[model samples]
Target: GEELFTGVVPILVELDGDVNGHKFSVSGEGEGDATYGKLTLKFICTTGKLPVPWPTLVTTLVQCFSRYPDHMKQHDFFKSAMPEGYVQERTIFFKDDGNYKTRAEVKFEGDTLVNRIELKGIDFKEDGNILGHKLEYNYNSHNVYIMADKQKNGIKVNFKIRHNIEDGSVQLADHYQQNTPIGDGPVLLPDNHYLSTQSALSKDPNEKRDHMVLLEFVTAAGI
Candidate 1:
């Protein structure tokens, strides 16, 4: 479907090329680490940020509502932001995690919530291999790309884990350096894990995942 507004852009999050090995499963499953194919995310906007024509807005909302009636019932915000709320059904591809290649056929079904990172794939049934271990004190970094459908080119951000071998405690870097741009650096959401309403981030919502980064993109009403 065509995007409705400049202020309401679709965002894409990709993990490819030298990805760190991690486990993924539907929320609350608590099964051992496994890879997933699809991830459905809930997208909502500020009430004042919709920049759509009235006719187009109503039409899109009707289509969304018809497709996902239960969505509105669950989220009270949809009462006002239905026109801006959407379910992003993203197809996930694990380029080469721990030496295996797989893809997830994700869907944005009416019965599921944003927490539904449900998956069914070839390698998903098999307990995935771990890329690295903290006990080894090895630093693991993964390449994560975030793209706005409205922008010409997307941006790339680094997700790294600093394993403290000395104390057996690990911590995450503030990621400020990775998020900032330097003289025509990466475009879009640069130097930050999360986006904001004015212009301008997930940490561990799941288990066994090395780094959980949320790429929240907001399109302003004006431009």
Candidate 2:
């Protein structure tokens, strides 16, 4: 026998085209924020586009951070920022593969994600029967990897992705903060008795204020 493992199957893919990003923003105070943060491409392994639920991974992070007296009990970041349970499932019958055409359209509205799939699997046993397939990932030590249950069925997926890195800086275009440096500047709000000790309800570049009680979100909602 040469090898039961027929040299890792035909689980490879080519880049369809350029990676793209679609942006949508809906800021609703602290009620919620519909901002795209981060994501991973989840080709149905069964692109070969998704490996895991990318959107759920970010949105589920909208969990609560509770505080406690103990150091370890400061918060609970579990079950957040990730989707739950199994998803996007499919199978390939007994087949010898080359390229399996799988094109899908995925959509997300807040926490809900749906994908419409269209596939033309170029895989089959000599008998021309579709074999059931599943992916059992050895999963990487630090990240995720691709491996299917019945990879021996000669089916695997591959994809291409685009990414970016950003560098930012700070520029000073003001008169007060630039000139008034390193001094207990006078309180701006002497008449506004809202605060007795530190009456600086608000501040500017010229007049900096203390960083105590007001180091919080004391602004009106939806600001």
Candidate 3:
């Protein structure tokens, strides 16, 4: 029997935005090559602002997506945003909340109308140790329907979530509501979070986790 293998290549495309704003555009492509018995992917990324600390932001995004390969499955987009080794599993520390920690991964798959995502190894602050948790997401591309009839056909991306643990057991947290844009255009869908607890567990009482699903879209091509 011959050894089996799989691989992917990606490219990043940054559409618009400045460094301080931390906004960009990304795209990617993947294919299986029988001759090499390996997967190949090409990625592209375009960013508008130059002095915006791109290295740090790009590094962080790559790390976040490594643990959750499903997030990168959008082969046509989002792959070329970082270096090759940039996407890998690593520990991220949050200082404000007594050094809370979590692991994440991302990947992309499927064509125009269907896409899927898988998130695993989610953990947070516990009696000086990390707890085990899992989060999985999937969405139908067609379900994210956009009305091209209006002007240039705005794009809408929808996401669904499933938790491995009991619904109201553990506290879920993320920094989605900051209303901060990663690139230029309007965020068709805003960043949202679904927490098991009505109240957030952050050290800051004012920071509450929003328990809701989110979708994003671009209002116009260049805004």
Candidate 4:
């Protein structure tokens, strides 16, 4: 059999036209004769306009798809759009990846904040998921009490977290801690102390004062 060479290469053309009262467009390339064989065309928009903006549409679609965990897991865009469980989560790291010693995560579940913290130190590390005012069963860690206090200025941290390491396969331990007071608040009693108390309590608290952890950076000089 003689090899017959057909001088035909697939062709692609950007097309835009109006049908009835709707305007439509297609992109990319395709190969076909003027009147022979068939081709496939996928038209994304048939429009003068869309009811919703493109970004809003995409966001709504992702949020809707998030309801179906199976679908979200299967779809790359859906999975990436709503990574981590199903809802969107924001994580802030205080240290490098491999050398991560502290970090905080706050995600949305319905309408409340799902606050989480990971703290690590020499021979001890723990992941504390703050639920209401307490930390529940955690892996290889002990119970760490947590609280979210609301002051007239903002929130302040006054508690410490602790964890333990054990030889058991599933390290489940309950640990208790005695509350230690860091600072005493203003007393209602009057005298020269009342003016200092008013000055301390009147000013708006700075953002750092609300942080759970505070660090002091000093120079190498011992003095």
- Residue pairs whose backbone atoms clash in candidate 4: 11-30, 11-31, 12-29, 12-30
Off by over 4 Å in 3: 1-5, 8-22, 26-47, 61-105, 111-223
TM-score computed on alpha carbons, candidate 1: 0.22
Global CA lDDT of candidate 3, please?
0.22
Winner by TM-score between candidate 2 and candidate 1: 1
* TM-score comparison, 2 vs 4, better candidate: 2
lDDT head-to-head 3 vs 4, winner? 3
Q: Number of the top candidate by lDDT?
A: 1
lDDT of 4 by residue, 1-223 (tens): 0011022223322324332223333232222221211222121333434221121111011111111122222221211221121222212121211111223332224322122333222221223211111221221211112221223211121211221223222222222211111123321111110000000011124522211111111111101
Winning candidate number (TM-score)? 1
Q: Give per-model TM-scores.
A: 0.22, 0.19, 0.21, 0.16
Worst ten-residue run, lDDT, model 1?
29-38
Tens digits of lDDT, candidate 1, 26-93: 21211110011112232222232212111111101111111112222221111122222333222332
RMSD of candidates 1 onward, in order: 17.4, 28.3, 17.5, 30.7
Candidate 3 lDDT over residue span 55-124, tens digit each: 1122122211111123312221212222111112223232222221222223332211111111122223
- Show pairs that collide, candidate 1: 37-104, 179-190, 179-191, 179-192, 180-191, 193-201, 194-201, 195-200, 196-200, 202-214
C-alpha lDDT of candidate 2 relative to the true structure: 0.19
Write candidate 2's Cα lDDT for 1-223 as tens digits: 1111112111111212111121111111112111111112212122333322221111111111111112322121111111221122222221232223334332223334333333343423322211211212111111111222232311122211111111222111111000111123221111111100101112234422211111111110110
Give all candidates' CA lDDT scores: 0.23, 0.19, 0.22, 0.20
